[PDB]
């Protein structure tokens, strides 16, 4: 039973870490490109901002799914009931 | 009571299903709910969704049955602003004469926003009011309907069914199968075009199946993560210490400030994706 | 977590709501907006 | 039965994490390029919009398949039946 | 027997995750370049998109095979019968 | 028990390390474009600074959660209580 | 005996997954520049395309060997008879 | 007791290595962009450098936290006291 | 015996997979710039092509050595002779 | 003592390898950008060079610390004293 | 000697695979710019190619050393003599 | 002692491989940028090359340190004596 | 401890958030709505 708990902890760590790494890389690239676009012309700063928010709505979907699943695994445990 | 038990109680829904003796009763334990088969209903999710939809429809009908057409009132100005925003969003993607896209997009957006707004209220206020009103100390009650994957799955299934129905209506089984198997790779030779159907079929089927799954799962995961973070922040206050509850309160303020924006963004993304997917049904992009 | 019949009933209600929005909400509002725009255009055509 | 469930947990974790990282990187790049294109052509913002709204359809298909199979492995187990 | 099943599950997870990551990265890059090209030349959108599809199959085919084998490793198992 | 503690330590290490790597990569990518925009348009430095701070606010979202989970796992063990 | 079969399954998974990831990344990178070149000179599309095909061969040949070797391991395992 | 200490050492090594890799990549990108900006605008160097330092203030936070946690693990290891 | 065979199978898998990934990435990167140069100078494709072939000579040498070593391990395993 | 020393060797290897990889990538990017800047304006070489040296410090310091840790884990071993 | 031989085989595989991956990536990156320069300026091809060779050794030398080490670990084994 | 030697073999392999990969990537990027600069300014080739050599001085220091450490761990073994 | 302690923290946090929304979120929406109404009234008066 201890091996199951340890592997569940490792699984949660992987779920959170990979999602955080991907989200950070994607948001860094998006922010750099948004800064370049804003520096190109300040008259479209607000609208473009909304657009990048739209990109965020697609950027971190699976990452939040993994974070939620890891939070469900840390406290609740469907694997323990399966023996 | 322990924190794990509190989380487990907050993670369980109210289930109505076929009891071992009689098809009339509510499950009292999680194992009993798991015993229920596919023919079970989540009373709280359906009730909250129906109540919010009815409230939205009544509010929008109040400002539509007596349209002044001149100087607008307080409620009708807000209704007109949202209607204009929805029309502008629709007209920028869909160029056809379909009269169903705009009302459907407006309904989806407002209904999702209302379903998400209820998550902002304190995690224990509504579950504890239901328990007092009912008189039970172990009643299960989840107010946030979007944390239940069933609602998002049903919305995605209905959107997919509408997409398929519209594509069929506009292309016949002819163009439907032609887009499914004979596009985007085509060849004049009979043998080559016969050998090219597996890749096209795989690509089109995979994308078509993956659309509603992603549409539902994005919202499902986002709101599940938000609700789990809120429940965990409640456990932070559960300790009872002095120096810890203030950090918990600050974290709650930050999480709510982020979560209102996330709530708006998820609804906007879902509405835009539904509009784009419906627009993709009527023309060929291949 | 638990796939149930809710995914049906929910969506059914969804459809009903959509139908109402196609019959009693959108048409009056778009008609009022178009009438206001027509009045504005008529006022601007005073030249 | 313990080892099978413990390894299925790691399997689900990898399934979610790799897909999340890939989707985050791809969406960040796509959103950055969309912002650059919108900055270049302010009047082409709507059309270009639907454009990447098609691209995402190809982008996350395999990731969504992986997420679905990971959920199927989390809540069901065809492996624990293979003994 | 249990170790073989667990390693097969890990194998399926690795296959699907790597395939999803590769497809997501490739599709993100391709969509970004297509967006840049469309923004530069709006009149060439109908042609260029077709060429994009020509790339897309080449981007996915091998990955598809992989995930197919993953399916062959989930509902079936040639490794179990070889013991 | 010992294996659980070792695997949770490895989990904390992965959680912090992947988050730090992603955060550093994203911050470098954002800062490069921020410096490019500042050099290109020296009169827009405050607005670009505010925008990059806003972007970094979203960038350090999952990394902070991962760091908090790692601290909770170092100073407490919900896995030990599960035996 | 079981360990050998499990490690062969892991080997097949790595063989297919790494090849799929590399193929997808390389094909996306190639397709982006192919689209850029097609947008630049629409009159050279019939030529450039076939040139890309040649590159595709060099992009896939080794990977094809991999997807052969894995198929040689799943069926008629040569490592089983060695022991 | 051996496994706990060995996995703690592996954890510290992973922490410091990932932190060093992330810091090196981010600082390399930031320094390259700073050098490009300084070369393009030689008279704007005194301000830009300062801005780069600000970026460093946000770039080394999580990595320094990880390094401190690794030092705390090596010198004041809390995992041994948890049996 | 058994562990040696399994580990050499994993070794061959890693040998082929890493080489395939590297050669795919390198050939995609080379082909993108080759297509860009051919599009820039349509009349210069007969020369540039053979030049890229020279690059292939420096690109696949280590990959061919690795695949040859993997085949030698698979069919004429020398590690089974040494225990 | 066997497992602790065996894992400490892997820890030192991971530390040094990750540090070398990160510093090599960062220094390559920095040197490429410095060469581009020097080529753009030959008369700014004496200044820009000094600037890059400062960046080198930010690219190296943390990595150097890791290297030191590796040395402290080679000739000395606090983990051995912890039993 | 069973585990020693197996881990030596894994070590050789890791060495050769990492060397091949790095060599392929570096040579592709170098060849892309070499082809771009040849396309832009045909009269500098005889010189630039030579310069590329000057880079190529620096790109390969260390990797070659690793390859040699792999050979020293294939037909010979200094680890077996240490029991 | 068997596992210690087996793990030090993997340690040496990782030490050489990661350093070789990083060195190859960095030198590929540096050579590409140097070729671009030489093509842009043929008259600055004698100077720029020298500068690139200085870059190599920073690029390969940690790689050479890791190679020396790997050679010391191969031809000698401080881990055998439990140090 | 446990119950009767989470409620106090939740109520305090909710009150703080409500005050923040009232002092920083409502006035912008109200001002935008009033500006739209004033623009519509000005257009009607011009017509």
Comma- or semicolon-separated keywords:
B: mainly alpha; two-stranded antiparallel sheet; 10 helices; 1% strand; globular; C: 47 residues; mainly alpha; 1 helix; 83% helix
Strand and helix layout:
The complex is a hetero-oligomer of 13 chains, with 10 copies of chain A (83 residues), 1 copy of chain B (286 residues) and 2 copies of chain C (47 residues).
Chain A: H1 2-40, H2 45-59, H3 61-75, H4 78-81
Chain B: H1 3-10, E1 15-16, H2 30-35, E2 41-42, H3 43-62, H4 74-91, H5 101-117, H6 125-134, H7 149-181, H8 190-195, H9 197-238, H10 242-279
Antiparallel strand pairs in B: 1-2
Chain C: H1 6-44
How would you characterize the overall build of this protein?
The complex is a hetero-oligomer of 13 chains, with ten copies of chain A (about 80 residues), one copy of chain B (about 290 residues) and two copies of chain C (about 45 residues). By secondary structure, chain A is an all-alpha fold. Helix content of chain A is about 90%, strand content about 0%. Chain A has helices at about 1-40, 45-60, 60-75, 80. In chain A, helix 1 (about 1-40) packs antiparallel against helix 2 (about 45-60) and helix 1 runs antiparallel to helix 3. The longest helix of chain A has about 40 residues, at about 1-40. Chain A is elongated. Chain A starts with a helix and ends with a helix. Chain B is about 70% helix and about 0% strand. Chain B has a two-stranded antiparallel sheet with strand order 1-2. Chain B is globular. With about 45 residues, chain C is an all-alpha fold. Chain C has one helix and no strands. Chain C has one helix at about 5-45. The chains are: A mainly alpha (about 80), B mainly alpha (about 290), C mainly alpha (about 45). Chains K and L meet through helix 1 and helix 2 of K and helix 1, helix 2 and helix 3 of L. Chains C, M: Belongs to the ATPase B chain family.
């Amino acid at each position: 039973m201890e091996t199951v708990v340890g592997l569940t902890a490792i699984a949660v760590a992987l779920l959170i870490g990979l999602g955080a790494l991907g989200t950070a890389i994607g948001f860094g690239l998006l922010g750099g490109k948004f800064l370049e676009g804003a520096a190109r012309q300040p008259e479209m700063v607000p609208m473009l901002q909304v657009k990048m928010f739209i990109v965020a709505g697609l950027l971190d979907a699976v990452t939040m799914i993994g974070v939620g699943i890891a939070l469900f695994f840390t406290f609740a445990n469907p694997f323990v009931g399966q023996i | 009571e322990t924190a794990s038990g509190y989380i487990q109680h907050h993670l369980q829904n109210l289930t109505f299903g076929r009891l071992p003796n009689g098809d009339w009763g509510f499950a009292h334990t999680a194992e009993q709910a798991k015993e229920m088969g596919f023919w079970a209903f989540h009373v709280d999710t359906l009730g909250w969704s129906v109540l919010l939809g009815v409230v939205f429809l009544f509010i929008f009908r109040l400002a539509a049955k007596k349209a002044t057409s001149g100087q607008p009132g307080g409620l009708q100005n807000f209704v007109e602003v949202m209607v204009e925003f929805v029309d502008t969003s629709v007209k920028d993607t869909f160029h056809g004469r379909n009269p169903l896209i705009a009302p459907l997009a407006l309904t989806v957006f407002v209904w999702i926003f209302l379903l998400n707004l209820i998550d902002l209220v304190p995690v224990d206020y509504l579950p504890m009011l239901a328990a007092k009103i009912t008189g039970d100390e172990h009643l299960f009650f989840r107010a946030v309907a979007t944390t239940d994957p069933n609602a998002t799955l049903g919305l995605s299934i209905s959107v997919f069914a509408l997409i398929v129905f519209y594509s069929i209506k506009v292309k016949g089984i002819g163009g439907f199968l032609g887009e499914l198997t004979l596009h985007p790779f085509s060849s004049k030779n009979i043998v080559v075009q016969i050998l090219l159907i597996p890749v096209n079929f795989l690509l089109e089927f995979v994308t078509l199946i993956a659309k509603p799954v992603s549409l539902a799962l994005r919202l499902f995961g986002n709101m599940y993560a938000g609700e789990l973070i809120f429940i965990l922040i409640a456990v932070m206050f559960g300790s009872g210490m002095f120096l810890l509850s203030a950090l918990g309160v600050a974290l709650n303020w930050a999480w709510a400030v982020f979560h209102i924006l996330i709530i708006t963004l998820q609804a906007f993304i879902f509405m835009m994706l539904t509009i784009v997917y419906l627009s993709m049904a009527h023309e060929d992009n291949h | 977590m638990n796939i149930n019949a809710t995914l049906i009933g929910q969506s059914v209600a969804f459809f009903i709501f959509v139908l109402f929005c196609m019959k009693f909400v959108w048409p009056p509002v778009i008609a009022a907006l178009q009438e206001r725009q027509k009045k504005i255009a008529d006022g601007l055509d005073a030249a």
